[PDB]
Symmetry: D2
């Protein structure tokens, strides 16, 4: 699993379940083309987005639909969504864990990169 | 001053100076059109991006060029940049302050609406 | 104003108003003795805690009563309070700004030393 | 495992390894008595701090020795350590995961509480 996403809820102190995640890869013409998508599980995690064969070097954008998540809880959020943009595998294959911590008017995202 | 940005450096414990910031507004055709831009001052703040007359309801994207900032310090960052996308409501008197806290492999952004 | 505190509310997107803050200085016998205290203003800031004459080198603890703040809003928080423990260096002109961002089950604190 | 601690390094994008953690429980006389301690593993995690039998209701303080960690990397940190103080098991046994994200002049801590 070369690309994993984990989302936590800072208001309830629990994993953010059923959060939609869309991943994009920047194409030759500087356009963001769909790459993979999914929803976080009961543990707030999303695995199996891609394979090492398909996850080649490039610039990727991970979009986390935070807005839908908060509205489903009756809270009015500030952000439309949380975005994480990074260059990946620029120097060989790496395993990426994108973690996000969510609050209505704030979020933090961290990346853990391992071999 | 309806829209203000503040950027801090969590590695050095100081404001992030001379960080380039680009703001975009989503156009009718779902395209991001340039709206305003600038660089943070010595206090890590960026004021005067727009006026209340120009800052109408809409979806905005604030892009903080974090990558250039870290490279200028000899550190290899993870993110290409930090992005904040939000809808400017305009329901009563409201000033938007977008704060960002930067680290090489992490960042947090918070919105203060007063 | 060598020591300033700023508290923000990540749930409401506003400054955390009327939050009690207690500062302690570690004494010779490794005991925490009261040093200063106050409540954040409408801007979520607390100024005038001490003077440069009184703020000498030492280990300080800034305690933010986050629990009372959340309960006053009808939310059950996780933490009893947020604590920031640091050594005031005093190596050249330096002002300390302790910023805290609050959520019911999480908080982040950052120090800006300018 | 009722009490688990996870520490990440926001500067290197990796788990914070070998970070010392001390847990205290507030005693009757309002004194902090040692409860458990350990060091984070290669994954930045610390398990087996206590058992459900021993982890009774009370106020606990989790101290993470962030200062030693940063100095061992040649960086001068701001904080002496990161502290997390909370009431636990006040309404029956719960599983607590204390997560901390570290930077030289900043840190964030989040709690995930499950049954």
């Amino acid at each position: 699993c070369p690309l994993m996403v984990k989302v936590l809820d800072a208001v309830r102190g629990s994993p953010a379940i059923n959060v939609a995640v869309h991943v994009f890869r920047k194409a030759a013409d500087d356009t963001w083309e769909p790459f993979a998508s999914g929803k976080t599980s009961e543990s707030g995690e999303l695995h199996g987005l891609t394979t090492e064969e398909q996850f080649v070097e490039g610039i990727y954008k991970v979009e986390i639909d935070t807005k839908s998540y908060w509205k489903a809880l009756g809270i009015s959020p500030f952000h439309e969504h949380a975005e994480v943009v990074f260059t990946a595998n620029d120097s060989g294959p790496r395993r990426y864990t994108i973690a996000a911590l969510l609050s209505p008017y704030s979020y933090s995202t961290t990346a853990v990169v391992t071999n």
